[PDB]
Amino acid sequence: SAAPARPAHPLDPLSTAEIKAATNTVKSYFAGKKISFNTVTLREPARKAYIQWKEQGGPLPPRLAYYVILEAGKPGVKEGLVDLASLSVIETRALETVQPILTVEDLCSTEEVIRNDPAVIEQCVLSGIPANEMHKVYCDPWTIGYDERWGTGKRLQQALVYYRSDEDDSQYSHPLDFCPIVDTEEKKVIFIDIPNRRRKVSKHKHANFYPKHMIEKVGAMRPEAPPINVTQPEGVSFKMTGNVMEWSNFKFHIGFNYREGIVLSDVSYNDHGNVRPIFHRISLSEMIVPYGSPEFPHQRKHALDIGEYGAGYMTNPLSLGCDCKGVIHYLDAHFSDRAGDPITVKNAVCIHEEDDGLLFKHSDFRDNFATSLVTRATKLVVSQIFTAANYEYCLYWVFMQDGAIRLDIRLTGILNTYILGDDEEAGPWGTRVYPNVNAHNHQHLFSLRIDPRIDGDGNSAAACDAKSSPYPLGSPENMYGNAFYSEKTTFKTVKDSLTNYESATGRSWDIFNPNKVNPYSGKPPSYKLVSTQCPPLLAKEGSLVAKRAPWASHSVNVVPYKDNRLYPSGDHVPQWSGDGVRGMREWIGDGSENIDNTDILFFHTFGITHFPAPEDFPLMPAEPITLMLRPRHFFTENPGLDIQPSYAMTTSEAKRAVAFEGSCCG
Amino acid sequence: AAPARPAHPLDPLSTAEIKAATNTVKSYFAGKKISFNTVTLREPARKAYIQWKEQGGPLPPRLAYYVILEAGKPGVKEGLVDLASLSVIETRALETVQPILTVEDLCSTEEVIRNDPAVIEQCVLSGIPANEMHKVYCDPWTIGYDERWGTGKRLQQALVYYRSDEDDSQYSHPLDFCPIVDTEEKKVIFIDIPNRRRKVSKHKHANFYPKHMIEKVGAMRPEAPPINVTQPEGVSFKMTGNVMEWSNFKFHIGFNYREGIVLSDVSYNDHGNVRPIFHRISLSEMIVPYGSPEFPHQRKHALDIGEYGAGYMTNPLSLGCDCKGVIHYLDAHFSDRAGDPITVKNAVCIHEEDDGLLFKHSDFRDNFATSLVTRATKLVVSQIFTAANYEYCLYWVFMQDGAIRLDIRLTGILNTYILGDDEEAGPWGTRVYPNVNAHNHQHLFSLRIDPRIDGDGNSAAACDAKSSPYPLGSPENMYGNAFYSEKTTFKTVKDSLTNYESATGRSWDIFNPNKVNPYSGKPPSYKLVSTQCPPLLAKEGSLVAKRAPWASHSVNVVPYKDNRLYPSGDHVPQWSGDGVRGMREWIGDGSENIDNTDILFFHTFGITHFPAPEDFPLMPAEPITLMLRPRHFFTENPGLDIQPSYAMTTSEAKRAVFEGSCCG
Ligand SMILES: [Co+2]
Ligand SMILES: [Co+2]
């Protein structure tokens, strides 16, 4: 065989050899044409085919690569599939009216283009920067997002322009007032948005943050603190076999791609020999970061970072014991560059276990707590950190010893900033965080995609709302007015599922298997989503934000499963106006399809609303986001009780250590 | 002849001061048979403390508050002792209240019920022979409130259970009936017996020690390889008595019988400018209302802080089990009924822990070679207390961005009641094991903040995210994306009575309207970021809502006055909830000014618990958290002078290794 070796596991990411085999296949299919590679990634097996292979002795699913290419002089993109075993293109089509994810190469070209463009140079000079100082001009290359002057007819970026007095400066204290529009493929500026009110470059010092800058600003650094050292002298408790993790009865596959970053698959829990599925797949599937200044051209700040840049493409190499402290297992990521050659991000994913405080404790007051049992918790963390120009997103998938799974996010990095004139008011749409610096209001919203398989196939979802009894105070049914219950609304059709978090009921959502019954409680096994960082989408209905991110206007969206329903703002996000039946809008359809007791997909919108303050500048302290999926009625008792306690003494042990009798303590 | 004065006016009473106070009170009431219920610091007046600390003012008097009972007299007496003069300076009799139930008060009840003929008869009817009363247990609760007796007797209710062996966890085997006990007479006065009898479960106990687990599931997991934490050069915090200094914070760590940990006089040293933040912060009350309407379960709504005391209930933490790493402990001291000091060793744990990343940024232009990373450390001041079945693990956390957070972990055992073989537990509870009904309930807490944000004269506000009122396609909001934060400053008490609202992602600011941040133009603040804010589910006019007037709003802001600590009143057990006391008194008619003055901010937070079998027989920790974050307090990130874990500038990276981007 001329073909690449098969992977250890059908969900493993393409290897570097597979990537090059796929791009050689595609270049040969398009021989004589000038093409460049935008995406070369695993096309995961169909859900049915994977489960049949894994659990039913079924066929080996074909090993497939999905590609996206551009061709010089042709609009839009072509996409397709390569069958790796046969080195052949098996599906292909041209999409002339979309634009694809912006890769690191696509973006890294823009600053050159603007520094050399005569119209940009003229605007720099009008803004107070001499023409021979263009090396001091920088830009963060953004997708244009959407601009109704061009649609998808050209592939465009917008350059958010800044100035550095010295290369070691943090540029964000010195935005310029104007916004060049760049044709990515022609490498040319095609327009510059210039405000009606000109604001020249700030004359203030840069707002810097390295130690040499801090010594100048505040006089000295704090002395190094005494260390806190973490060691695991007998190694770790988890076991990896390729990308497959085993830890504390969990087993799952750790995948990775250019767009979602980490993808956790085939998640099960070994309940005393009974290996019980939980999720087929869980990942972040899209984001949107909509800014809240209505002034032109700031409507074009609403990056969909996952679909427009890629949480894999943006991911940082983590080594070593700075980002991830302790004893660490790393994974690398592999992509294609534009030439079709593999590229590697070393140490893209960090895996480790950490102390997580107490798992459970109880002591008996009767012998003054001599009867006591204490068990400490350990958590497993699978992490990446990606950089979207100014911001850093730190992602932590956390498994815990009560069977819960949590996603923790920490936001850090730098505020997006725009220039503020000397006498200009930033509010109500932003904050003056430093002289002449306006940090606009914004949200950070994420779409968690869960493909559940709670205790096996055939699942449903529900909203669970705490409610007082409807019977009044002083009735026979509620004499003292204290009765309350959980109202469970099972979603029958897609439209039923379109629901928001509600503080008035402390709403949670269940994902459950209606085919099974817990023998104690009589309720179906479930994982419960406990999530309260669930902002409303503030942009209004019919806005460009709401149209491009149809998923973001509800906290929960549940649709039928179909293969290839990954990305809820569509497969090719940049420059889509938000008009059309694609992504989540397609999957919702008329709202009528069944989602009760079937294969479903559960997409959860969560995140934060950010009103900047000076504490966030020039570099932002981490701000946390979290959500939890908790087993409820899944087990018949606390699943962690077979973990050896940290301390345990029974009543009979404590007695030995020292009419009817009362309490020992009486 | 007086006790030594303490190092600091807010230090808790020493054992010597406790005994000096109870000797003074016994001499004042000479010839009378009295018992001690509470003997605790009466903290200095806020004005007197601040004057002493900051203005060279008078040393405040060192005072003890006491509560006593007298044999044959109703209610309590309470008063103050001036320690320097060994004299009672204030005293009064309150004949129609009942006070906190101490460990001694509660320790007695199981003896009483085991020996009571009517209880023995009910045990026999329930399937337990009369000569097996040593296998009958009860958790002694306050009666909470029962309209048959008011405050006219001091009462407990006994939640009764059965153990087949003393090492069992009893909660799989509740009995069906509820004795009512006169605490001071040590007698059963009544037994609530259900119309439907349910005899004791015949199932095995639902046990959780390793010997039980080996029998149940065959084997324990092997010991996991260790994770070891060491600080070979010591810790970065410094204590001087109860005064903590860490990462520019300075504060006093106090403790009492009722609130447990009390953090006082909290400041941040902003590059030599020592800026107040809070005068006092603590948990001031709780309520844990159950949601079964059936009699007598309406009496399960413990106000654990006011009825038992988070100090009285607190565990000795000794252990590198409860608190892992390099730990500083504090002891707690109280009085017993005889007036002798008692000690709980290792009541408070103090330590620092890694807390992940503080901040990071890298420049894509040189593929992240330009990078700065700084790791975070947190300071944790913790206690764990046991309220019979439940464990409450409390963690006050200071962080290096200037934020303060309170983290709680709930663990221990569900309250359980018996369920008949054919009885449905829902909708008010869950069958978590055969014949075991775990009723629905909430756990609610009242955080009390006495702020001094950047000094004296503070206000509070609700902050609501809102879309612009201008429509999509208007000149003012062409693309429909505009949004802002609507700040509603509370002018009078009534304005402050507000709930968390998911629809606006509501936060609350506590701010100083006399000052202005020179960059943003906004007042310095600490913002309460808190979303675990349940509605009170019990109806208006219910026992629960009347006894916990603070619990029906997420936020209550009132004027400061001295001695406004406890929002369900000073003597909680057996109060019906009728009357103008506690938070109801402090709210008054709602009209008093709370803008730019001395205020108190009481925040209700917690969870609503629908039990599931995972919670049984022993519950995995369930988290609750809230944060108070500086916003417009500093002019830049305050942590930037912490040494990075890693830093490389662009010029350094170039050395190590018009033009475009380096990576182009
Ligand atoms: Co932000
Ligand atoms: Co509970």
Curated annotation (Swiss-Prot), chain B:
Classification via SUPFAM superfamilies: Amine oxidase catalytic domain (SSF49998), Amine oxidase N-terminal region (SSF54416)
Induction: By methylamine.
Annotated residues for binding of substrate: 302-313, 387-392
Active site annotation, chain numbering: D304 (proton acceptor), Y390 (schiff-base intermediate with substrate)
Cofactors that this protein relies on: Cu cation; Zn(2+); L-topaquinone; Mn(2+)
Cofactor note as given: Binds 1 copper ion per subunit. Can also use zinc ion as cofactor.
Chief subcellular location: other
Subcellular compartments: Peroxisome
Glycosylation site list: N228
Disulphide linkage map: C323-C349
Binding of Mn(2+), residues: D450, D598, I599
2',4',5'-topaquinone found at: Y390
E.C. number(s) listed in UniProt: 1.4.3.21
Gene Ontology cellular component terms for the protein in this record: peroxisome
Pfam families: Cu_amine_oxid, Cu_amine_oxidN2, Cu_amine_oxidN3
Signal peptide: none
GO annotation (BP), single: amine metabolic process
Molecular functions (GO terms): copper ion binding; primary methylamine oxidase activity; quinone binding
Record-linked PROSITE patterns: COPPER_AMINE_OXID_1, COPPER_AMINE_OXID_2
Residues involved in Cu cation binding: H441, H443, H609
Superkingdom of the organism of origin: Eukaryota
UniProtKB keywords: Copper, Disulfide bond, Glycoprotein, Manganese, Metal-binding, Oxidoreductase, Peroxisome, TPQ
Effect of D304E: Strongly reduced activity
Family: Belongs to the copper/topaquinone oxidase family.
Subunit structure: Homodimer.
Annotated protein name in UniProt: Peroxisomal primary amine oxidase
Gene label: AMO
